[PDB]
């Protein structure tokens, strides 16, 4: 018993291990052109940029979404491309993250204090405050189709403004929003929090995302980091 | 933003 939106939805999830494939390939042939005489920030950064490639191509192939025209499709995609990647990490660590490991996008796992020894003091603070969500969804029993509906919610979000058919973007949020509603309702109904405690958890992802993005834009302006993740920083 | 033009466009 799932709404029919919502098995629509899951039909446009990417194949997770080829998305992690690719990634992993990509990165090992970068090291290899390179001379042993790239800072662990600056390699995150290069995953990071190839996890655009494939969040772009996922919103392209996406129902509703590919009905809107490019100009539109841009503006949603800048207002919101930091909050997917935040919540794609969160999602990972929900499913296959363990305490004091972090895994990445290219199917490693990593542990905590040798990240923490590198990450710096505000992307440690950022990282802390997703892992407070990692835990808040875990003890909720976050699941695939609450994952699904909360990234169409990010990327049709109401705060995108001068699109030419707002109509649309308006109409999605409703819709996800109501067929959330049921499918909690439905499949935890010894859960009246649930609802409301995922929704509570958009805004606190968007103030973690901004802060990176922030962030990440204060790291560019100093030259530690041309490729996508810039073009989204400006833009 | 020319590149995330293009990556919508291709083929
Ligand atoms: C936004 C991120 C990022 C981080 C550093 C540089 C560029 C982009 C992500 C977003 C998810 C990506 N995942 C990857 C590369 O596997 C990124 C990696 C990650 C986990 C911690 C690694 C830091 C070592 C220097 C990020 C993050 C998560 C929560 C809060 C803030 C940042």
């Given at each position: ?107 490693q796992q990593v542990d905590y204090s040798i990240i923490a020894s590198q990450a710096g003091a505000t992307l440690n603070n950022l990282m802390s405050h997703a892992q407070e969500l990692v835990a808040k969804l875990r003890s909720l029993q976050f699941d695939q189709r609450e994952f699904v ?87 | ?11």
């Amino acid at each position: 018993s799932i709404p029919h939106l919502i098995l629509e939805l899951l039909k446009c999830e990417p194949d997770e291990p080829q998305v992690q494939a690719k990634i992993m390939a990509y990165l090992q042939q970068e090291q290899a052109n390179r001379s042993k005489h790239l800072s662990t920030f600056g390699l995150m950064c290069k995953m990071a940029d190839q996890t655009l490639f494939s969040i772009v191509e996922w919103a392209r192939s996406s129902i509703f979404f590919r009905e809107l025209k490019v100009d539109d499709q841009m503006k949603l995609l800048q207002n919101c491309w930091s909050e997917l990647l935040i919540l794609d990490h969160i999602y990972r660590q929900v499913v296959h993250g363990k305490e004091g490991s972090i895994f990445l996008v290219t199917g490693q796992q990593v542990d905590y204090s040798i990240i923490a020894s590198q990450a710096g003091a505000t992307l440690n603070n950022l990282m802390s405050h997703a892992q407070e969500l990692v835990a808040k969804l875990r003890s909720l029993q976050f699941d695939q189709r609450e994952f699904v509906c909360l990234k169409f919610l990010v990327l049709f979000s109401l705060d995108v403004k001068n699109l030419e058919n707002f109509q649309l973007v308006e109409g999605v949020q409703e819709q996800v929003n109501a067929a959330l509603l049921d499918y909690t309702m439905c499949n935890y109904p010894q859960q009246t929090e649930k609802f409301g405690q995922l929704l509570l958890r958009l805004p606190e992802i968007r103030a973690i995302s901004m802060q990176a993005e922030e962030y990440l834009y204060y790291k560019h302006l100093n030259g530690d980091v041309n490729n996508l993740l810039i073009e989204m920083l400006h833009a | 933003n020319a590149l995330l033009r293009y990556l919508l466009d291709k083929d």
